Scaffold this motif. Structure first.
Motif, PDB file in Angstrom:
ATOM      1  N   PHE A  94       0.820  -1.207   0.000  1.00 23.00           N
ATOM      2  CA  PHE A  94       0.000   0.000   0.000  1.00 23.00           C
ATOM      3  C   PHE A  94       0.858   1.263   0.000  1.00 23.00           C
ATOM      4  O   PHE A  94       1.599   1.525   0.947  1.00 23.00           O
ATOM      5  CB  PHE A  94      -0.942   0.004   1.206  1.00 23.00           C
ATOM      6  CG  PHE A  94      -1.560   1.342   1.489  1.00 23.00           C
ATOM      7  CD1 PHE A  94      -2.545   1.855   0.663  1.00 23.00           C
ATOM      8  CD2 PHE A  94      -1.157   2.085   2.584  1.00 23.00           C
ATOM      9  CE1 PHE A  94      -3.113   3.089   0.924  1.00 23.00           C
ATOM     10  CE2 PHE A  94      -1.721   3.317   2.850  1.00 23.00           C
ATOM     11  CZ  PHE A  94      -2.700   3.818   2.020  1.00 23.00           C
ATOM     12  N   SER A  95       0.750   2.038  -1.074  1.00 24.52           N
ATOM     13  CA  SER A  95       1.488   3.288  -1.207  1.00 24.52           C
ATOM     14  C   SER A  95       0.600   4.382  -1.782  1.00 24.52           C
ATOM     15  O   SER A  95      -0.180   4.139  -2.701  1.00 24.52           O
ATOM     16  CB  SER A  95       2.719   3.092  -2.089  1.00 24.52           C
ATOM     17  OG  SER A  95       3.438   4.304  -2.227  1.00 24.52           O
ATOM     18  N   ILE A  96       0.725   5.591  -1.246  1.00 25.65           N
ATOM     19  CA  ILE A  96      -0.050   6.715  -1.752  1.00 25.65           C
ATOM     20  C   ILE A  96       0.668   7.396  -2.915  1.00 25.65           C
ATOM     21  O   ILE A  96       0.923   8.600  -2.895  1.00 25.65           O
ATOM     22  CB  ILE A  96      -0.339   7.747  -0.644  1.00 25.65           C
ATOM     23  CG1 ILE A  96       0.887   7.924   0.260  1.00 25.65           C
ATOM     24  CG2 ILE A  96      -1.579   7.333   0.169  1.00 25.65           C
ATOM     25  CD1 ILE A  96       0.756   9.070   1.206  1.00 25.65           C
ATOM     26  N   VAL A  97       0.981   6.606  -3.934  1.00 23.84           N
ATOM     27  CA  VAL A  97       1.584   7.108  -5.160  1.00 23.84           C
ATOM     28  C   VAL A  97       0.910   6.428  -6.337  1.00 23.84           C
ATOM     29  O   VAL A  97       0.646   5.228  -6.289  1.00 23.84           O
ATOM     30  CB  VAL A  97       3.103   6.853  -5.196  1.00 23.84           C
ATOM     31  CG1 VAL A  97       3.697   7.274  -6.532  1.00 23.84           C
ATOM     32  CG2 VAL A  97       3.792   7.576  -4.050  1.00 23.84           C
ATOM     33  N   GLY A  98       0.614   7.196  -7.377  1.00 23.88           N
ATOM     34  CA  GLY A  98      -0.138   6.682  -8.504  1.00 23.88           C
ATOM     35  C   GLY A  98       0.525   5.481  -9.147  1.00 23.88           C
ATOM     36  O   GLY A  98       1.748   5.426  -9.288  1.00 23.88           O
TER      37      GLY A  98
END
Lengths: 9, 413, 406, 9
Positions: D1-5
């Protein structure tokens, strides 16, 4: 529209 | 009793017969979830002054590149008093107003300091290395918002971003559509209050608590009419209280059929349907009542706790949203994959479920929980979806795990 | 000044350093959005009495099919006093309790009425099984059963479940109290008319509105002058009154470091918007307060708020997975990629004839701003640029962070 | 889970 489920094969 | 109403006809008649409430003026801070009943115009420019976009120096573009004397610094929040004459520049930071002389800004990355004051440790002279275009790196007066510009349209469903915008343009009082006040009651001789201990033949009232909580989640004011005995007198009194106090009246239970009798003969109300071909929610009844040019609407939901909360999101919530001025009060419908196998009913079927998105998958999964009163999935997440299962056909009789179905969003994701 | 923090590391460090708040006892009616700090056990059975599932007649199964005299009707809300004897039957409705005699219910569709009032007698056409069409004592909930686990994020359905089992007071995690302030000599209050060189404060209104949307209590510390004295005093008020302090717009970091003796974890983040975002923690009397210093740019403020502040608040209130929901969607417009990971407010709309939702940019303010009557409910997650992909085209699938009710 | 597109082919 309709609040009745629309099925797809 | 009542004719069988199709699921679509029932819904459409709810929205068509549901009135849109009047308007009121509220403070902008309380504008969360409100619908604008007016256009909003800016009475100022944004910015009201020409402002620098970059840290550097405000220059006269016609001067071009070269060595210039720095006459001072423009600080944010104070309108500069000095006028830049040819061969001079003024130090500027981001957001600072541009002085009278300059017509362009050169960023500090494009300059070199030449000389500093003999002391006082201030910049004295800088070399502008680039030829600025007129108006370069400046946000001119009214660049973002001009005076007289409409910043928000009538009908705008306001969120936090809009509220800040109201704060921007200085419109702190704004006219919006009123919120519906919703009265909720439960009928039945077996119902006791949750606060009470059980007595023989009795159970606790959960419909009332759930329904009020559901309506509160949408930010609407509610009225607790408590538990009403299953008899015309106490029932009529309860309705009379709900009408004088609320715009919407919701009741559950009471299958004779004392409720339908009271609405028809005593209140002279219009019962639009009393049965709807659906599962759950078959005995769902919807009626309207016109008093003094004002239309009240009444919901008679099934006594079953699951049927109540399902039909509430299907019929009550879209109505409430129309009432508060929402231009498309229709619910959000998303495509999702079944987490479990399901059998189809001749009726259109609805189940509470949890929507979950998986990173390696385009579509979300929906996991049924609407199998209450037998096996209840103890999840740490509240149900945020309403599964919309199709009615059975000659060809398709069963839906398999993974197959795509429609899911109605009924909460924050 | 400060090292450049990667987007992922900034996020993880916020969540790792944000504490989970203490517990308190609340009424079940006010439990909306709360997280249980206790297991909830039922103290009754549901139903507490055997109840019919169908409308028909409660019969003795050993009697089998035949003609029976109807000795009465069991009415909901009243525990029956009559006992069904062999050759007798009792009329029942759905919510009604089963009489002492019967051990099964036969629905009216499977029976025929024999005698009527001047119902008296019925003929049972089917052989009932024991317990048929009856929900026995504790069928739905058994006494002593855990109906709700610790850590459950309660919604309306859970509130009703508590109401059912009669647990009206329940222990939950506290909600975070959030204090919000703005700094800058150009800032005037929204209620005020403009003065030369000044503008109106919108950051404070937006941030507060965002936090209120999630149901958290807030404190408005108003606009603070850009000087250490006024700045320190405001912060001390925020610490003494709230669990979280948010400010927007060099003086600030000095006060945190030198005056408050706080720990500043990062001061710059490789992102767009939100580069000058600062996050700090402060431990006073065994209690950890957290501080968010958001950028002065209004868009930068609201974007960084949803990315860093909201997940922090959710962890604080006891939510087990405070991470935001990310959904796959299609661009409505062409967009160019930046070396930084990029974020834009957008509107998600689902089309019945299309599997995936569409994302329409609105984060192109200060030039062309889309005046829609729908509020932005999504945060577009644009990737950092690569050697091959420099631009993303209409229709292509990107990540969108849900930031509101749909 | 990463908050990068995440890119799609």
């Amino acid at each position: 529209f309709s609040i009745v489920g629309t099925l797809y094969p | 009793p009542f004719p069988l109403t199709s699921m679509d006809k029932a819904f459409i008649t709810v929205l068509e017969m549901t009135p849109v409430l009047g308007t009121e003026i509220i403070n902008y801070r309380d504008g969360m979830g409100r619908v604008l009943a007016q256009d909003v115009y800016a009475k100022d420019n944004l910015p009201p002054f020409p402002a620098s976009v970059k840290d550097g120096y405000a220059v006269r573009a016609a001067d071009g590149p070269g060595d210039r004397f720095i006459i001072g610094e423009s600080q944010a929040g104070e309108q500069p008093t000095q006028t830049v004459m040819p061969g001079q520049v003024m130090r500027v930071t981001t957001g600072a107003p541009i002085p009278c002389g300059a017509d362009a800004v050169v960023q500090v990355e494009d300059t070199e300091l030449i000389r500093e004051s003999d002391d006082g440790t201030e910049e004295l002279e800088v070399r502008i290395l680039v030829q600025a275009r007129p108006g370069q790196d400046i946000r001119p007066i009214g660049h973002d918002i001009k005076r007289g510009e409409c910043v928000l349209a009538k009908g705008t469903h306001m969120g936090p971003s809009e509220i800040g915008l109201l704060a921007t343009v200085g419109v702190t009082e704004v006219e919006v559509n009123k919120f519906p006040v919703v009265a909720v009651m439960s009928t039945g001789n077996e119902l006791l209050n949750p606060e009470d201990d059980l007595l023989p033949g009795k159970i606790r009232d959960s419909n009332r608590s759930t329904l009020l909580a559901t309506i509160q989640e949408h930010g609407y004011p509610t009225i607790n009419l408590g538990i009403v005995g299953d008899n015309p007198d106490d029932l009529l009194n309860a309705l009379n209280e709900g009408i004088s106090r609320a715009d919407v009246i919701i009741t559950s239970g009471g299958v004779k059929d004392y409720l339908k009798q009271v609405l028809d003969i005593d209140l002279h109300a219009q019962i639009h349907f009393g049965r709807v071909f659906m599962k759950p929610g078959l005995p769902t009844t919807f009626a309207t009542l016109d008093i003094d040019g004002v239309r009240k609407i009444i919901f008679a939901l099934p006594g079953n706790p699951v049927s109540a909360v399902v039909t509430c999101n299907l019929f009550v919530v879209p109505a409430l949203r129309k009432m508060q001025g929402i231009l498309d009060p229709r619910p959000t419908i998303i495509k999702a994959r079944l987490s479990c196998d399901v059998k189809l009913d001749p009726r259109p079927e609805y189940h509470r479920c949890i929507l979950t998105w998986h990173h390696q998958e385009p579509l979300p999964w929906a996991q049924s929980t609407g199998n209450q009163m037998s096996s209840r999935l103890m999840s740490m997440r509240s149900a945020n979806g309403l599964l919309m299962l199709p009615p059975k056909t000659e060809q398709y009789v069963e839906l398999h795990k993974g197959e795509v179905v429609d899911v109605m969003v009924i909460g924050r994701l």
